[PDB]
Design a protein around this ligand. Structure first.
Ligand SMILES: [Cu+2]
Ligand SMILES: [Cu+2]
Ligand SMILES: [Cu+2]
Ligand SMILES: [Cu+2]
Lengths: 78, 278
């Protein structure tokens, strides 16, 4: 079952998620229009490449963790 | 080759290690290690092919990856070996690890920028090139995202686990490998990445030289586990889809198997490693 899509502005940045050199992962996340690699773990938690070792419950939580990590910086594409 | 506790390096050993690391960066060789790592981080998945992470081969894969990096260092200075960081013992920001004559300390609070040591962006010697967060300076927030490093008591409870790994051989497994990797339990190796913060908390974590010292201690804990459990060995042992079996070769090298990497003494020893005993 894929998670639902989402779209919001979080700490001033547009984050989006949608069901769909890296894995073919069934969900995409974008931060200000740039795609962020994210991955789902067996227990249903999610991570992203900029917060890979800290599982969070949902792809939106991963997108928000990425905006926190970035501290305003643009993401570079993978 | 003897791998030494970082806390015990002489001033001359620290100087030579740092100079060798900076030369690999200057010559362009360093960044290819960062890129390989991030490619496995992004490609290793719990429901598909998995080789460097979230799988039984997490330990032999990082052992060979660190061997490749140590051999690169030795091609620059043949006396240098990788030191290890025992984060269960040297657990505060005042560890000599984090001094300006070694790896430099924590990042300033506004942007996480490391401001001292040889790898500080202001030196001009440590550009962050292979990256996802577009900033190009080394960042850290020691203890920022997680309150404490693992303790010796926590490490001991993971070393006491008899089974190397267990089906389903991924981040949901019980068993030693996944408790050390950290996806189940009190979390050892992943928690340390979180605790350092900055690039170490990302798939491009080898951008921070502490990466190598962390993994050298994870590698030492595998050696300790084998001493504790001489009767227990790598699993699985053949015919497992998407997982590297004992005698299967491992990407990217393709010329090495977990079986060839179980015994570290063929490549290096440690300054101290308890032998088997009750
Ligand atoms: Cu992917
Ligand atoms: Cu790795
Ligand atoms: Cu690691
Ligand atoms: Cu015995």
């Amino acid at each position: 079952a894929a998670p639902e899509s989402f779209d919001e502005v979080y700490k001033g940045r547009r984050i989006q998620g949608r069901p769909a050199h890296e894995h073919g992962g069934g969900y995409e996340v974008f931060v200000d229009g740039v795609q962020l690699h994210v991955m789902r773990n067996a227990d249903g938690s999610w991570i992203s490449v900029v917060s890979h070792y800290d599982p969070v419950p949902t792809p939106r939580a991963a997108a928000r963790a990425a905006v926190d990590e970035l501290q305003g910086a643009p993401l570079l594409p993978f | 080759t003897v791998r030494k506790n970082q806390a015990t390096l002489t001033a001359d050993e620290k100087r030579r290690f740092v100079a060798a690391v900076l030369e690999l960066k200057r010559s362009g060789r360093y960044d290819e290690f960062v890129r390989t790592h991030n490619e496995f981080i992004m490609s290793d998945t719990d429901s598909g092919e998995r080789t460097g992470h979230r799988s039984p081969s997490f330990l032999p894969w990082h052992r060979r990856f660190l061997l490749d990096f140590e051999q690169a260092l030795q091609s620059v200075d043949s006396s240098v070996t990788l030191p290890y960081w025992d984060w269960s013992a040297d657990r505060t920001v005042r560890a000599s690890l984090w001094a300006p004559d070694f790896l430099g300390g924590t990042g300033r609070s506004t942007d996480g920028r490391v401001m001292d040591g040889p790898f500080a962006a202001s030196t001009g010697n440590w550009p962050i090139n292979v990256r996802v967060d577009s900033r190009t300076y080394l960042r850290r927030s020691l203890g920022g995202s997680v309150a404490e490093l693992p303790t010796r008591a926590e490490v001991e409870s993971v070393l006491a686990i008899s089974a190397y790994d267990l089906p389903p051989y991924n981040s949901a497994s019980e068993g030693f490998r996944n408790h050390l990797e950290g996806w189940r339990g009190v979390n050892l190796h992943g928690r340390v990445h979180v605790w350092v913060g900055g690039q170490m908390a990302t798939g491009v974590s080898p951008n921070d030289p502490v990466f190598w010292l962390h993994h050298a201690y994870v590698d030492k804990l595998w050696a300790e586990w084998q001493r504790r459990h001489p009767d227990s060995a790598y699993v699985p042992t053949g015919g497992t889809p998407d997982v590297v079996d004992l005698n299967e070769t491992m990407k990217p090298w393709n010329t090495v198997r977990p079986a060839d990497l179980l015994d570290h003494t063929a490549y290096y020893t440690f300054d101290a490693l308890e032998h088997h005993h009750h």
